[PDB]
């Protein structure tokens, strides 16, 4: 969800995903395909979906994290007078970046918990499975 | 009241006179006497006492019935062979006790018209299986 202390406001720009395209901490992984912004609550949503479907307990790695403050001006104001005041928080997930890692669950379980998380997501995704030893 | 026969399988506690929840309208709806089964089966529970001996009841028609009385589940004598009158919460996170390979010789000797098994090893290990997921831990095995 939120960061704890910071600077306040920000900006916007894009190209392909820095690190990391590879599958650590787990056996199955879910990957972006589109240059989105991702809000806390959207992740929160995926977290709760997958957490329920796994029941107790599995193991869930939420790689992505919202450090980026997005603002929205008040209702019905003429432009200017200031910058909008922190509406919510996004995490700038670029394509190929791995958003999710789950392990301690079968392939089937992983597929499903993934698909369920996917339908809650602003962007297309793909699941995959290890071999990406660029390092470890 | 008619002639629509039926082979009905059930289960009743031995030494009790059943009310509305067990029998009543469960097998008295095919056509059989209930006044002469509280003086029939309840008198052969004076044989083997204190268990839930399974019964199978076949009904012809009219006022006819024929029943078979099997063997008492020694899950009333394995919970008695420990100290808990109601089974374990789980069989692999809270056990019960430990019977013997000779309290198995009264399982496969009352259950001789039961387990279609052959030799002693088979007829012992079969209901050594019942006492697996019931919670209890077994005394024995090979070697020793």
């Amino acid at each position: 969800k939120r960061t704890k202390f910071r600077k306040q406001f920000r900006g916007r720009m894009t190209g392909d995903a820095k690190g990391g395209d590879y599958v650590a901490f787990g056996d199955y992984g879910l990957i972006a395909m589109e240059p989105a912004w991702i809000k806390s609550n959207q992740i929160e949503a995926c977290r709760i979906v997958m957490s329920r479907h796994f029941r107790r307990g599995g193991k869930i790695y939420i790689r992505i994290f919202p450090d980026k403050p997005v603002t929205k001006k008040p209702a019905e104001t003429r432009m200017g007078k200031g910058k909008g005041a922190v509406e919510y928080w996004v995490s700038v997930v670029k394509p190929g970046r791995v958003m999710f890692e789950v392990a301690g669950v079968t392939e089937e379980q992983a597929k499903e918990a993934f698909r369920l998380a996917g339908h809650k997501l602003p962007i297309q995704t793909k699941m995959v499975k290890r071999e990406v030893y660029d390092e470890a | 009241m008619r002639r629509v026969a039926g082979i009905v399988k059930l289960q009743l506690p031995a030494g009790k006179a059943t009310p509305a929840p067990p029998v009543g309208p469960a097998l008295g709806q095919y056509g059989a006497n209930i006044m002469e089964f509280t003086k029939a089966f309840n008198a052969q529970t004076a044989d083997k006492g204190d268990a839930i001996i399974p019964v199978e009841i076949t009904i012809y028609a009219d006022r006819s019935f024929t029943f078979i009385t099997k063997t008492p589940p020694m899950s009333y004598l394995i919970r008695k062979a420990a100290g808990i009158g109601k089974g374990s919460s789980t069989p692999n996170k809270a056990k019960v006790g430990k019977l013997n390979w000779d309290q198995v010789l009264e399982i496969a000797k009352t259950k001789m018209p039961d387990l279609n098994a052959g030799s002693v090893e088979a007829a012992a290990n079969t209901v050594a299986g019942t006492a697996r997921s019931m919670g209890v831990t077994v005394e024995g095995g090979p070697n020793a």
């Binding site: 392909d16 990957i31 307990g57 995959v128 990406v132 030893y133 | 996170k93």
Partner: protein, 175 residues
């Protein structure tokens, strides 16, 4: 495996399903390009501890190991490969997969087997004979039980690049 060309120019192979690669002897250094399909079957089979034979379209066939692989982030597929031309008696340091064997007595009272570090990099075997996997027993292991990098059974002539009190295959509680 049988690559052919090696110029600095890629248009000769790009679409045709080939990967750009380099294999270096440490004295001898050679660029080239392998059929993808092949190296896929291959690298899947043999992984990083691989060891397979490489005959350049000129007659000369040399044995080698896989040192690094470079991916398309968006297509998730090989575009380039770093290849170590093996030596003989001492190689380099080999990263090998920790596995797990037998129903642990952790998954039976509450928790689960968690390979806290999938890939363990050892120093040396004598190259010809590389450990390709690395079985660790876990049946003794309860919930709250860490396996340090020490306790791993190496197959003689093998040492540990790892700090051998570092947590590997550990079994975690539920919830």
């Amino acid at each position: 495996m049988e690559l052919t060309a090696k110029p600095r120019t890629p248009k000769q192979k790009l679409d045709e399903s080939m990967i750009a690669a380099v294999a270096y002897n440490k004295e001898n250094n050679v660029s080239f390009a392998l059929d993808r399909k092949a190296f896929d079957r291959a690298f899947r089979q043999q992984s990083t501890t691989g060891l397979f034979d490489i005959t350049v379209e000129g007659g000369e066939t040399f044995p080698a190991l896989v040192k690094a692989v470079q991916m398309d982030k968006r297509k998730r597929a090989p575009i380039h490969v770093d290849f170590y031309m093996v030596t003989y008696g001492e190689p380099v340091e080999v990263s090998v997969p920790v596995h797990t064997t037998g129903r642990s007595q952790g998954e039976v009272q509450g928790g689960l087997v968690d390979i806290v570090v999938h890939n363990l990099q050892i120093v040396a075997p004598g190259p010809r004979r590389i450990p390709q996997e690395l079985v660790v027993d876990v049946t003794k292991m309860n919930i709250g039980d860490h396996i340090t990098a020490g306790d791993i059974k190496l197959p003689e002539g093998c040492t540990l690049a790892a700090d051998p009190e570092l947590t590997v295959v550990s079994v975690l509680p539920p919830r």
